[PDB]
Amino acid sequence: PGKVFNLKKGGAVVRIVRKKEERKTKPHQEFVKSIIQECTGMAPYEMHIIELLRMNKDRHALRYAKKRLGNIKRAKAKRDQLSVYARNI
Amino acid sequence: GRRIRVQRKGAGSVFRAHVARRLGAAKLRANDFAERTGSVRGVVKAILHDRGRGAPLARVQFPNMRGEGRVNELFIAPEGMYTGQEVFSGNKATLHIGNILPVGNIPEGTYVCNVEEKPMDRGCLARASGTYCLVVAHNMETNKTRIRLPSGQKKLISSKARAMIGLVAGGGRTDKPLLKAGNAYHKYKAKRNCWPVVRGVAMNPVDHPHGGGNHQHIGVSSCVPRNAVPGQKVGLIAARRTGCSGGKRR
Amino acid sequence: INPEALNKHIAEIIERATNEKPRKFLETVELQVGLKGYDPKKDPRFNLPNLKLCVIADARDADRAKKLGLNYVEIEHLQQFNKDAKQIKKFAKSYDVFLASKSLIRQITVYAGPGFTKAGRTPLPLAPDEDLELKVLECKVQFKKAVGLNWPIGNVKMPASEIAQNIMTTLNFLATQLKKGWQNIKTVYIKSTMGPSHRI
RNA sequence: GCCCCUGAGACACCCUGACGGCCGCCGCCGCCCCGCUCACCCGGUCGCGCGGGGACCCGCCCGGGCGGGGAGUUCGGCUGGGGCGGCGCGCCUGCUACACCGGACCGCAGGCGUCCCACGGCGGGCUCAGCGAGGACGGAGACCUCCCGCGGAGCAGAAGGGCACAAGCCCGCCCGACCCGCGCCCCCCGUGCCGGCGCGGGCCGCGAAAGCGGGGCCUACCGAUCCUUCGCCGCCCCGGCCGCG
RNA sequence: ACAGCGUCGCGAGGGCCGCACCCGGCGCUGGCGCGACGUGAUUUCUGCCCAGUGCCACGACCGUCACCGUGAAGCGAUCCGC
RNA sequence: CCACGCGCCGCGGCGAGCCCGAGGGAGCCCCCGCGGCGGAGCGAGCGCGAGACGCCCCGGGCCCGCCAUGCCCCUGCGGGCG
RNA sequence: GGCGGGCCUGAGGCGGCGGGGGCGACGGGCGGAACUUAAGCAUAUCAGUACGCCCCGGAGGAGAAACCAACCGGGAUUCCCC
């Protein structure tokens, strides 16, 4: 396969590079995404997904998102992010 | 592997239009503020002969609206035009033979030449020698006058189209046989280099699709589809019914 | 299915049911049901499994089966009926459910046929060799040409909804022998001559 | 009124399902039809006194045709020249073949490209085509008898071998016309491939048994790599891991 | 070749061609026009055939017959439907 | 003819070894100088992995893998022994 | 309508300064063959070559990881040995 077989692999101690001080969007990046979303509005592909959710539930909503965004992981996030707008009107 | 005579025709050079010595284009008066509200008069300077077009060309000058000098415009001559005739032309110009007026104002059944396909096209349909158009009805339903084209189709033009009352002069031109082929060499000496023509079954096979077999047979049916490749369309194009039938009238 | 919702309503048409007062699990129910997506060229023909059944024997029935139910009849007891063949061609007039003997059926083999093929069944297995009435389950989900069909509710004279399990016995089955397993079904409603009920 | 009694089928016992039908009902989707000008495309002029189209075309992106008008090729072989009239171009029987075997030919006399779960396997019985001589109708001729019956019969078809308490014929069963691993012979470079043959094991059949059987008495009746399809137990995905591939 | 003779397409927002696109030629033209054709001056006539094979039909929409689109279904690569 | 790949063959050095590689060295023909090729095979892969003889040569017999299979059993559709 | 200012998108002229073309190699970007090979030929192959085109330098291009690796791990590019 892709690993050699040494039952006792490990003869030197290993330090794990990790986190690199794992950060966040921080206050400004999110705030700005609010400033623009407020004036410009939602894109048409997004509008269809939200409208699918008030009536249909998921399934076909994800299917439109896979075609428009091109990958399920981006689509699963997009369907979920879009849903927050859906449960109000 | 060589293109047919039709293919080389549009290349230009040799197979082009001889236009030298031709006096110029035949067009009506420019439609304008004076023509729209009134009529401008015009003397007939001369009725010259075009080199290329058998049809007489008539030079008529009108008073230029702005500059003092008179502008000269060449009109296809309507039969009955006389040197010194004053063609009164405009929206309010009468139906006396030779005037240029909005087809809508012209009454039903009139004989018209040089009708315009769309408003102010400066001359379009019915220019050939001896040809004419008739207003079947000046219908006001959509400001559209009916026109019977010389060929006889029924088309419509916007009432604001303009034309000359009277048949295009020079009629009966093709009745006389051309006779001696030389009259044909001279006739086409003012037109395209389309004379003399070589038939399809005569040419060797590398040149024409009809080509030549052992016995000069067309080889297949002349009717060739409308949507055929440029090189293929050499036979009768899209025939709806070949042959000679009950005359041509049904 | 809503086991909690309207699956506890199987006794809901209480004194509303009346309708001849048959005496059973209140409303007749019968769980009106239909098949969606079933095609003529599909794949569901077979049988497999208050009350109206009849069984009989000569080697113990008068006490083992007839005492407390059924009827007092031997392996024959028709005679001129086994020659006229009228009532048997449509046994529903006579034997409402057909279980006429097991292990003693040898006596009738000589003169039998048109009614038992018309009715479709006669000698099913309940006999004096077994304690008679141990197999009282003559009950029936039949499928092939028609829809889900209004098949038996599950009896359950017991009150409340122990029949919810029997309603689910039909649910445990039915999805069997269907092209779209459980998807190929169209109606989930409860109504019959009983009276006013609700969707399951 | 009824499982009153009668049909393939209560219909008075209310719910379904079917097709029509449809009030009408859709935060649904396809499709058209008409405006309007504000892109876009036309025509007038010396932009000196304006018109015509119109969200349409067009371009462009895939998609479905049609398309020697173009290209690029290919157009087998043998063979008393070519010869494509024939196929001896793979295969088999009997010759030719000159007594081991091997021996040529658009040389002769012919076939093969299939057919049959019985036309197979096995066990049992049986004797066949017919020479006669007899017997209602009944004679070349149909059947039923004996008798003598070396095969003169039939065994799916070419021909030649071969066969008689059978390899023919009938019956009773039954799947051996099965799997796992091999060798040998035939063509032969002693390579393939078809066709057999001889075995090591498994498992069944048939018969009391010994035996016999991986087809049809033998010699003809068929298929490389690649690729698809599929069967059986598994193995692999490469940094892991789990399902689907 | 040829006059004659017929057939054929077309109303220019169009026919028929050039050309890699740009964009030309027919056309300083407009159906007595321009292409596409066969036949070959008149005199005298041109029969019979639509089966095919061509062509032609805002002739039909029956059968097939695409990308779209979009019904399900599956976790999704997909997969069936119209 | 020259190049480089290959298959044998004859030599020369050395031997489970052997190797002027690119390079570095005040050196040029001299000194130092790896990957490589062997030393172990077989199996599609998981992977697993040769002793027992013999002047040579030929067989024979065995052992290793890939297969089947019978037993025994540990740490276990794992190991052993046939 | 007139007139004058600021901004903005433009129109000529002036001043300074660049830019164009050449070189039989090397170099960077395209456009792009066929003969040939497969004993024929279509996919292949020749070949990401001839030739056409544009551009630069004394070298250019490339270059400081959205990188290989899976190890008791490396560390921009460029070249060379394998």
Estimate in Å the CA C44 to C1' D116 gap, whole number. Answer: 39
Query: Nearest CA to C138 among C148, C155, C125?
Result: C125
- Gap between the Cα atoms of C148 and C36, Å rounded: 9
Q: Which two tokens stand for residue B123?
A: 């001359």
CA distance B107 to B91: 13
**From residue B60, how far is each of B161, B171, B236, C169 by CA, in Å?**
20, 21, 43, 105
Residue B224 CB-half CA count within 13 A:
17
User: Which uninterrupted H or E stretch holds A36?
Assistant: helix A26-40
Contact between residue A70 and residue A76 where contact means Cβ atoms under 8 Å apart? no
Spatial distance between the Cα atoms of B139 and A18, rounded to a whole number of angstroms? 87
- Please give residues of chain B from 13 to 72 whose alpha-adjacent beta carbon (CB) lies under 7 Å from any atom of strand E: 15-17, 19-20, 22-26, 50, 52-55
B108: tokens are: 């039903």
Convert B78-101 to b/e letters by CB count within 10 Å (16 or more is b). bbebeeebebbbbbebeeebbbbb
- Alpha-carbon distance of B148 to B166, in angstroms, equals 15
Return d(Cα B180, Cα B202) in angstroms, integer. 23
Determine the Cα–Cα distance for residues C108 and C80; give it in Å rounded to an integer: 13
C33 CA → D198 C1’, Å: 70
The alpha carbons of chain C give a radius of gyration, in whole angstroms, of 19
| Element of type H or E holding A40 | helix A26-40
Tokens of A35: 């400033």
Which strand G nucleotides have any atom less than 7 A from protein CB atoms?
70-73
Query: What secondary structure letter does DSSP report for B197?
Result: P
How would you class B214 by CB atoms within 10 Å of its CB: exposed for 0-12, middle for 13-18, buried for 19 or more? Answer: exposed
Q: Spell out the SS3 assignment of chain C.
A: CCCCCCCCCCCCCCCCCCCCCCCCCCCCCCCCEECCCCCCCCCCCECCCCCCCCEECCCCHHHHCCCCCCCCCCCCCCCCHHHHCHHHHCHHHCCCCCEECCCCHHHCHHHCCHHHHHHCCCCCCCCCCCCCCCCCCCCCCCECCCCCCCCCCCCCCCCCCCHHHHHHHHHHCCCCCCCCCCCCCCEEECCCCCCCCCEC
Residue B115 burial class via C-beta count within 10 angstroms: exposed 0-12, middle 13-18, buried 19 and up: buried
Question: Which tokens belong to C1?
Answer: 């299915």
By C-alpha to C1' distance, D16 is nearest to C32
Tokens representing B80 are 């009955």
DSSP, residue by residue, B2-56: ---HHHHHTT-SSSSB--TT-------PPP-HHHHHSEE--EEEEEEE-SS-SSE
DSSP of B154-190 = EEEEETT-EEEESPBSS-STTTS---SHHHHHHHTTS
Indicate the residue type of B117. E
Residue type, C18: T
Cα separation, A55 vs B243, whole angstroms: 66
CB C87 within 8 A of CB C81: yes
Within a 10 A sphere around the Cβ of B216, how many other Cβ atoms?
Answer: 13
Cβ-Cβ contacts under 8 Å for C40 (sequence gap 6 or more): none
Q: What 3-state DSSP class applies to B211? A: coil
Chains that touch C (3 or more CB pairs under 8 A): none
- Quick one: tokens of B21? 């010595």
Amino acid at C145: K
Q: How far is the CA of C59 from the C1' of D200 (A)?
A: 63
Q: What is the Cα–Cα distance from C43 to C65, expressed in whole angstroms?
A: 39
The dihedral built from the CA positions of residue B188, B193, B199 and B203, taken in this order, carries a sign that is: positive
Tokens of B9: 């025709």
End-to-end CA, chain C:
6
Helix axes A60-69, A44-55, angle to 10 degrees: 170
Contacts of C123 by beta carbon, 8 Å cutoff, 6+ apart:
C99, C100, C101, C102, C105
What is the Cα gyration radius of chain B?
A: 23
Tell me the C-alpha to C-alpha distance, in Å, between residue B144 and each of A64, B105, B117, B151, C50.
50, 11, 11, 20, 87
Pairing of the two strands C55-56 and C99-100: parallel
**Paired tokens of B106:** 């012209």
Cβ-based burial of C42 (10 A; exposed 0-12, middle 13-18, buried ≥19): middle
Q: What share of chain B is helix, strand, coil (3-state, %, to 5)?
A: 5, 25, 70
Separation between Cα atoms, residue B88 and residue B60, nearest integer Å:
11
Task: Report CA Rg, chain A.
Answer: 21
Nearest to C122 by CA among C80, C153, C76, C83: C76
Cβ B171 vs Cβ B129: under 8 Å: yes
Tokens of B71: 């502008």
From CA C126, how far away is CA C76, in angstroms rounded?
Answer: 16
B66 in contact with nucleic chain D (CB within 7 A): yes
- State both tokens at B192: 């395209």
- Residues C121, C98 contacting (CB under 8 angstroms): yes
Pull the structure tokens for residue B143.
């400001």
Residues in chain B: 250
- Asked if strand D contacts B158 at the CB level, meaning under 7 A, the answer is yes
